[PDB]
Amino acid sequence: DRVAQLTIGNSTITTQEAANIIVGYGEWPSYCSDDDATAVDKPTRPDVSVNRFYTLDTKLWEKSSKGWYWKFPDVLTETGVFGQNAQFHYLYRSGFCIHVQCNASKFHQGALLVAILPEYVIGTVAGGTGTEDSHPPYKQTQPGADGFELQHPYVLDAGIPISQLTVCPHQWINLRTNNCATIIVPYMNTLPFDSALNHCNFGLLVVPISPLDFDQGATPVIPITITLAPMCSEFAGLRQAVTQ
Amino acid sequence: DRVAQLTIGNSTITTQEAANIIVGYGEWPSYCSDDDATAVDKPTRPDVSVNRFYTLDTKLWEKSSKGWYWKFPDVLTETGVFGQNAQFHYLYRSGFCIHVQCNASKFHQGALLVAILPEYVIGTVAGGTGTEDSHPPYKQTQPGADGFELQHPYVLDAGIPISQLTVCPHQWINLRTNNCATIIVPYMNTLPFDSALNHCNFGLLVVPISPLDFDQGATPVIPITITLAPMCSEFAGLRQAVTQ
Amino acid sequence: DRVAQLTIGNSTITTQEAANIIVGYGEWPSYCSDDDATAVDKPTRPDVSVNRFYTLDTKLWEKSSKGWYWKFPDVLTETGVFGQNAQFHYLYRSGFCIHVQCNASKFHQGALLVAILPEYVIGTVAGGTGTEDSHPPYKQTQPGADGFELQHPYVLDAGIPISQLTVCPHQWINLRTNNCATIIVPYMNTLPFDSALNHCNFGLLVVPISPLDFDQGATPVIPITITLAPMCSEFAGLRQAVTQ
Amino acid sequence: DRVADVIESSIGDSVSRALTQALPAPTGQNTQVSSHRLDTGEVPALQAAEIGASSNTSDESMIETRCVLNSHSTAETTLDSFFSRAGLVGEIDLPLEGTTNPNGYANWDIDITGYAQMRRKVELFTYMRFDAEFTFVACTPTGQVVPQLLQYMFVPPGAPKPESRESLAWQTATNPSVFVKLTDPPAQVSVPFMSPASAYQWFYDGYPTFGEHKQEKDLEYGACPNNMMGTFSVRNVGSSKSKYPLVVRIYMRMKHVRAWIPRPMRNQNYLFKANPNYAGNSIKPTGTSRTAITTL
Amino acid sequence: DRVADVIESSIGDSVSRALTQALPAPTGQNTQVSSHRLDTGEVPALQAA
Ligand SMILES: CCCCCCCCCCCCC/C=C\[C@H](O)[C@H](N)CO
Ligand code: NA
Ligand code: NA
Ligand code: NA
Ligand code: NA
Ligand code: NA
């Protein structure tokens, strides 16, 4: 139960210090029913070429880090064959298998909260005073694969408490216990299909709740890598490639 | 088998580095038979209010410690509802679940012998020369919850070898192996009931056979805590509260 | 599976960090068939007096060690009752249970390749230039119990690559994983019986493929001990004791 | 005849594999008798929060419990019990003199996100599907009931919004309208689930249109048209100025409610309607604070 | 009619639960034939005092 292997497509992930697997809302990704669908054109289900593990950028965990987030359909729109299909097709649909990995040693300590927040809408500080109706820039609402850093993690940059973020599919990475978190997310939206460009079904939040710490001499560079794989990907409404 | 939980009354003990459980003389505590009894009055069996875990004082294990001991009916006579019943009633009877706990690190070392010695009668050094018939004071024969320290552990302060103390229900706390000892003791006496004030059925001995040791820098304070719970407690011969 | 015990004769070996057991060429040692034999005299099968664990010299693993080897029938010819029988009898036959042991700590590192090479013929550097037809001395071809050190481990002092030495019954001692290697070898030769003095059926090679390393302060003396036990020993052709 | 990986393929499975099942729970769970347990191997109290699952430890395994036949109902915590309570969601002013709808008519953009109480509750969930009951309480700014006839009209998106009290749009040949006097009890009406989506979204993490998303258009981030149900228009049924100043309070009661994906409850004060902006200089803690962690 | 924790209660059990039994032993135990055992998983020699 502490060891596990995730194989999908032509990619395999290994781990010897896992903490089980979470299946968001107790549901596995699935394809769209014939009665839940509307688009009449036959969709493309590329399978193995898009349903595989993509490893996005690595972040560095510092004793003062606040946390980061990634919007999901988004992080992959410019990567591999998944990205190509997401650009050529109007409609997209899929679940995800998210595997956040971060290892240290038996002498390091700290705890990361890895959670999935559906429809993660970002807010602004409203000019500090709260009298200015400002809005988050495109660079912040859809940060891409590089993710974005939280400025006010306590309120998740959206006026909501992070202490309650656990009502969402989550898992923790407690260095003294495990070195990775695995969460499987089904397609969640009020529509059977939607644009992979304009809409971000959910956001991945990785936030240090218990600060990283260690004594001088132990390796100081502790990376946090994000690996994710689409599941049951379906695309429809073919046309030319659109970036945004 | 290394992990365990002891629940009794409204108290629960946890451990992840145990070494099984010892049941003194292969017998579980039980109530008094109708043919083993003499007192004709109906006894009180308070159950949950007295059969629970009481945590007595903590001792500090030093690189030079000799060892300590606690007389049992005694240690509890002034604590909780067990103590009240032991004071109000002439006759008392019960078994015990003793849980000695002491944790360190994978870099500390040492071994404690935790044993139960029935009718643990204390002797004196007889004025050194052995010509003076002196006797141990009340403060030493019945030390209460604070326990008492051994002056000559080799002879258990009673002229008997500690090397043979293992013929008694015992267990060891070897820091590289476990961090606690659990011993369950049945009621042992030549009478079905007896006074909880004048008589001490047995004594708990915690003695360092292999000295504690560690390198400077590792936490130097290594406590030894004693937690114990009465079992199948019965009291009879009600009157006013008597302290001694 | 990580723990094991090897009992044979009046000797027992224990281990808590093993890596299974290898049975050379998938065959257990056995006695000689009545149709595979030629010598007509009835052999001696001393059993318990010769089929037991003999512990030969200890070697010191240094950060610069090259590796050692032991020729087998040989290492035992001057030890115990096995040696006596090997000297008094012309013909000898037997399998072996080899147990190489070497422990360190969770802070040391390194990997030893423990392999069995049948008919391990030693070659010389041929005077460096390769024009001199020199030959290895008796002290090197049959080093006895003290073993011999490799001068050119890369070519196993015989012009063959050590990188392929794994096609032979082998096992590794990776300090972070196990602290011993166990290999069981059947009698291998083109004859049913042979001289224990003139012929060495195989050689035991212990070579550091990944150098030993640790930080100053951790114990620097890391020994490698060789323990071995004959199996199904048979001797025939009795006469006076011959040393060589 | 056909490639094996295609036969044994599972691409196409439309049924969602559910690991959990909804069981009947009309009352709180009962407590069963429990005795002491002194054993190794079994540790109910020890958990591993890293797994992401809440502790499954029960009262019975932590202390010696008695038997309690719990008959406390769980009916008042259903979604309908929680949301089926009318609350203020809109307020329209029709003054005599001023700069706010002084021409005897008003157009209220249907959005229940203008009031904190009602808004915070619904924002506990991400998606919600429901029918509703709208009640319109009208009177003057002093609470006085006046003999005045009003006309409320629901203008779905695309229909012509009235530009004046005498606009031709007030003919309501197709739009639903309600004519009431302030002397009559508040008008009440039933509304269905009219979104083109399968549910309303209190949160839409995306943009409504394609193209470059420049600074000037960041106004559209988080704006989902599937939630924009249209306009609510009011007017004095006449061709002359009304003799009294009016106010119309709109209350909404949800019925037949379905809800999905719960979220953390609003932590900071609300500032605007179309977004979750908060005052960055006044970020207050979720709750009360104290002097020391070791003192009450 | 009666509270459940009282029915299922075990307070009153006068019989001492014994984990061990006295067996006949008129003579010293015999020794049985033993052969070599080269296997992993089983370690008779290793104990935990
Ligand atoms: C005289 C007839 C009047 C009829 C009025 C009908 C009103 C129907 C209102 C439906 C309101 C749905 C509100 C749902 C979502 C919010 O608008 C959005 N979250 C705002 O962003
Ligand atoms: Na489906
Ligand atoms: Na619970
Ligand atoms: Na119930
Ligand atoms: Na008009
Ligand atoms: Na009894």
- Name the 3-class secondary structure at D168: helix
How many Cβ atoms from other residues are within 10 Å of residue D39's Cβ? 12
SS3 letters across A15-76: ECCCCCCEEHHHECCCCCCCCCCCCCCCCECCHHHCCCCEEEEEEEECCCCCCEEEEHHHHC
- Please state, in angstroms and rounded to a whole number, the distance separating the CA atoms of residues D238 and C138: 127
Burial class, D31, CB count within 10 angstroms (exposed 0-12 / middle 13-18 / buried 19+) = middle
Tell me how far apart the alpha carbons of residues A94 and A235 are, in angstroms, rounded to a whole number: 9
**Is the CB of residue A122 less than 8 Å from the CB of residue A141?**
yes
Residue whose CA lies nearest to ligand 1 atom number 8: D191
Structure tokens at A185: 């997310």
Closest CA to C154 of C22, C66, C82: C66
**Strand blocks (E) in D140-289:** 149-155, 177-181, 187-191, 200-201, 231-236, 246-262
Q: Do D67 and E5 touch (CB under 8 A)?
A: yes
Name the E residues in 14-33 with CB < 8 Å from any D CB.
none
**Cα distance between residue A146 and residue A59, in whole Å:** 9
The structure tokens listed for C41 are: 């005299």
Instruction: Count other Cβ atoms within 10 Å, centred on residue B193.
Output: 23
The CA distance from D224 to D205, in Å, is 9
Beta-strand relationship, A222-238 and A89-101: antiparallel
Do residues A237 and A90 lie in contact, with contact meaning Cβ atoms separated by under 8 Å?
yes
Nearest to B98 by CA among B209, B214, B225: B225
Strand-strand pairing, C89-101 and D87-94: unpaired
Residue B82: in which H helix or E strand, if any? helix B80-88
**C87 Rama class: left (phi>0) / alpha (psi -120 to 50) / beta:** alpha
Contacts for C26 with CB less than 8 Å, ≥ 6 apart: none
H helix or E strand, kind and range, residue E37: strand E37-40
- Distance between CA atoms of residues A36 and C146, nearest Å: 79
User: Please, which experimental method was used?
Assistant: X-ray
Distance (Å, whole) CA C212 – CA C210: 7
* CATH code where residue C82 lies: 2.60.120.20
Strand-strand pairing, B11-15 and D231-236? unpaired
Q: After which residues is chain E broken (C to N over 2.5 A)?
A: none
Helix (H) or strand (E) holding E38: strand E37-40
**Contact A202/A115 with Cβ under 8 angstroms?**
no
How far apart, in whole angstroms, are the C-alpha atoms of residue C95 and residue B68? 57
Rg, C-alpha atoms of chain D: 27
Q: What is the rounded distance in angstroms from the CA atom of residue D116 to the CA atom of residue D273?
A: 10
- Residue A224's DSSP bridge partners are A59
Helix (H) or strand (E) holding E40: strand E37-40
> Would you state the structure tokens that stand for residue D126, as one six-digit string?
């991400």
Amino acid at B42: K
Query: In whole angstroms, what is the distance from residue D75 CA to residue D70 CA?
Result: 14
Chain B residue closest in CA terms to D38: B6
Nearest-10 Cα torsion for A146, A152, A156, A161 = 160
The secondary structure of residue D161, as a DSSP letter, is P
Q: Both tokens of residue B172? A: 């060891």
DSSP string, chain C: ---EEEEETTEEEEESS----EEGGG----PPPTTT----SPPB--GGGTSS-EEEEEEEE-TT---EEEEHHHHTTTSHHHHHHHHHEEEEEEEEEEEEE----TT-EEEEEEEEEET------TTTTT-S-----HHHHS-GGG-EE-S-GGGTTTTS-GGGGGGSSEEEEETTT-SEEEEEE---SSSSSB-TTT---EEEEEEEEEEEE--BTB---EEEEEEEEEEEEEEEEE-S----
Pocket test for ligand 1, best of D83, D89, D131, D154 (most atoms within 8 A of CB): D154
Residue with tokens 């190489």: C100
Whether D7 contacts chain A with CB within 8 A: no
Q: Taking a C-beta distance cutoff of 8 angstroms, is the pair C29, C186 a contact?
A: yes
Question: 3-state DSSP helix/strand/coil percent for chain E, to nearest 5?
Answer: 10, 10, 80
Distance between CA atoms of residues C182 and C5, nearest Å: 11
Token representation of residue D189: 């009406």
Instruction: Kindly report the protein residue whose alpha carbon is nearest to atom 20 of ligand 1.
Output: D111
Q: Which of D152, D157, D150 is nearest to D189 (CA)?
A: D152
| 3-state DSSP helix/strand/coil % of chain D, to nearest 5 | 15, 30, 60
In this structure, are strands B22-23 and B180-185 parallel, antiparallel, or unpaired?
A: parallel
Q: How many CB atoms lie within 10 A of CB B202?
A: 24
Q: By the CB < 8 Å criterion, does D61 face chain B?
A: yes
CA distance A56 to A37: 32
Task: Single out the residue of B203, B185, B178 nearest to residue B96, CA to CA.
Answer: B185
Per the structure block, which two tokens stand in for B64?
């030079």
The encoded tokens of residue C156 equal: 């196993």
Beta bridge partners of D38: B6
DSSP state of E28: P
Cβ–Cβ under 8 Å, residues A202 and A116: yes
User: CA of A207: how far to CAs of A96, A105, A177, C223, in Å?
Assistant: 20, 19, 17, 47
Task: Read off the DSSP letter of residue D23.
Answer: -
CA–CA separation, B222 and B112 (whole Å): 12
Distance of alpha carbon A167 from its chain centroid, rounded?
16
Q: Pick the atom of ligand 1 nearest to D178's CA.
A: 1
Is D204 within 8 Å of A121 (Cβ atoms)? yes
Residue E29 CA to residue D190 CA, distance in Å, equals 92
Residue B1 Cα distances to A208, B5, B227, C194, E40, angstroms = 34, 11, 20, 52, 21
> CA quadruple C143, C146, C152, C155: dihedral positive or negative?
positive
Long-range contacts, stretch C165-168, CB < 8 angstroms, 24+ apart: C165/C113, C165/C115, C165/C117, C165/C205, C165/C207, C166/C113, C166/C115, C168/C115, C168/C116, C168/C117, C168/C118
Q: Please give the helix or strand (H or E) that residue E4 lies within, else none.
A: helix E4-7
Asked if C5 and E36 come within 8 Å (Cβ–Cβ), the reply is no
Q: Does E43 contact chain C (CB < 8 Å)?
A: yes
CA proximity to B103, closest of B4, B242, B222: B222
Q: CA A241 from chain center: how many Å? A: 24
Phi-psi map region of A119: left, alpha, beta (phi>0 left; psi -120 to 50 alpha): left
User: Could you tell me how many CB contacts below 8 A there are between chain D and chain E?
Assistant: 12
The CA dihedral of D137, D140, D141, D142, to the nearest 10 degrees, is -100
Our answer on whether A and D touch (3+ beta-carbon pairs < 8 Å) is yes
CB contact under 8 A, E16 and B31: no
Rounded-to-integer distance, Cα A182 and Cα A98, Å: 6
Q: How many CB atoms lie within 10 A of CB B45?
A: 17
Contacts of A97 (CB under 8 A, 6+ apart): A6, A8, A53, A182, A183, A184, A185, A228, A229, A231
Strand partners, C6: C13, E38
Query: Any idea which residue has 């700590």 for tokens?
Result: C105
How is residue B42 annotated by DSSP?
P
Q: How many CB atoms lie under 10 A from the CB of residue A88?
A: 15
Residues B45 and B205 sit within 8 Å (Cβ to Cβ): no
Identity at A16, one-letter amino acid code: Q
Cα–Cα distance between D78 and C188 in angstroms, integer? 79
Cβ neighbours of residue A235 closer than 8 Å, sequence gap 6 or more: A43, A44, A46, A85, A86, A88, A89, A91, A92, A93
**Over chain A, what HEC string results?**
CCCEEEEECCEEEEECCCCCCEEHHHECCCCCCCCCCCCCCCCECCHHHCCCCEEEEEEEECCCCCCEEEEHHHHCCCCHHHHHHHHHEEEEEEEEEEEEECCCCCCCEEEEEEEEEECCCCCCCCCCCCCCCCCCCHHHHCCHHHCEECCCHHHCCCCCCHHHHHHCCEEEEECCCCCEEEEEECCCCCCCCECCCCECCEEEEEEEEEEEECCECECCCEEEEEEEEEEEEEEEEECCCCCC
Sheet with A180-185, side-by-side order of all strands: A22-23, A180-185, A89-101, A222-238, A54-61
Ligand 1 atom with the smallest distance to the CA of D202 is 19
| Ramachandran angles phi, psi of A103, nearest 5° | -115, 155
Q: How many domains does chain B have?
A: 1
* CA atoms of B222 and B60, how far apart (whole Å): 6
The CATH number that applies at residue D291 is 2.60.120.20
Q: Which residues, 6 or more positions from D255, have their beta carbon under 8 angstroms from its beta carbon? A: D80, D84, D130, D131, D132, D133, D190
Rounded CA separation A149/A59 (Å)? 10
Please give the Cα distance from D130 to D193 (Å, whole number): 6
Cα separation of C94 and C72, whole Å? 11
Annotated binding-site members of A: 57, 146, 215
- Which tokens hold the place of A33? 């029913």
Cα–Cα dist D177/D154, whole Å: 6
Residue located via tokens 């063959």: C160
Q: Are B66 and B157 in contact (CB under 8 A)?
A: no
Q: Are D130 and D254 in contact (CB under 8 A)?
A: yes
d(CA B206, CA D134): 76
| Strand locations in chain B (E) | 4-8, 11-15, 22-23, 54-61, 68-71, 89-101, 109-118, 148-149, 170-174, 180-185, 202-213, 222-238
In this structure, how many other beta carbons lie within 10 angstroms of the beta carbon of residue B137? 10
Tell me how far apart the alpha carbons of residues E3 and C212 are, in angstroms, rounded to a whole number: 70
CB contact under 8 A, E15 and B30: yes
CA-to-CA separations, A238 to A89, A187, C95, D11, in angstroms, rounded = 4, 21, 72, 20
The first and second tokens of residue D15, run together, are 């049924």
Name residues whose C-beta falls within 8 Å of residue A207's C-beta, 6 or more positions apart in sequence. Answer: A66, A67, A68, A112, A113, A115, A150, A153, A162, A165
What single-letter DSSP state applies at residue B119?
T
> What's the structural domain count of chain D?
1
H helices present in chain D, as ranges: 4-7, 59-62, 79-83, 116-122
Give C31 to chain E, closest Cα distance, Å.
Answer: 15
Q: How many residues does chain B have?
A: 244
Min Cα separation D163/chain A (Å)? 28
List the one residue out of B116, C39, A119, C36 whose CA is nearest residue D128. A119
**Protein residue closest via CA to atom 17 of ligand 1:** D111
Q: Per-residue b/e over A130-158, b at no fewer than 16 CB within 10 Å?
A: beeebbbebebbbbbbebbebebbbbbbb
Buried/exposed C168-197: b ≥16 CB within 10 Å, e otherwise = bbbbbbebeebbbbbbbbbbeeeebbbbbb
Q: How far is CA A119 from CA A201, A208, D261, in A?
A: 5, 22, 10
Strands, DSSP E only, in chain D? Answer: 37-40, 87-94, 105-109, 125-139, 149-155, 177-181, 187-191, 200-201, 231-236, 246-262
Collapsing DSSP to helix, strand or coil, B7 comes out as: strand
Nearest to C100 by CA among C223, C209, C4, C211: C223
Beta bridge partner(s), residue D212: none
Q: Using an 8 Å Cβ cutoff, are D31 and D59 in contact? A: yes
SS3 label, residue D86:
coil
Alpha-carbon radius of gyration of chain A? 19
**Residue-range definition of the domain harbouring residue A212:** 1-244
Residue D192 CA, ligand 1 centroid: distance in Å: 10
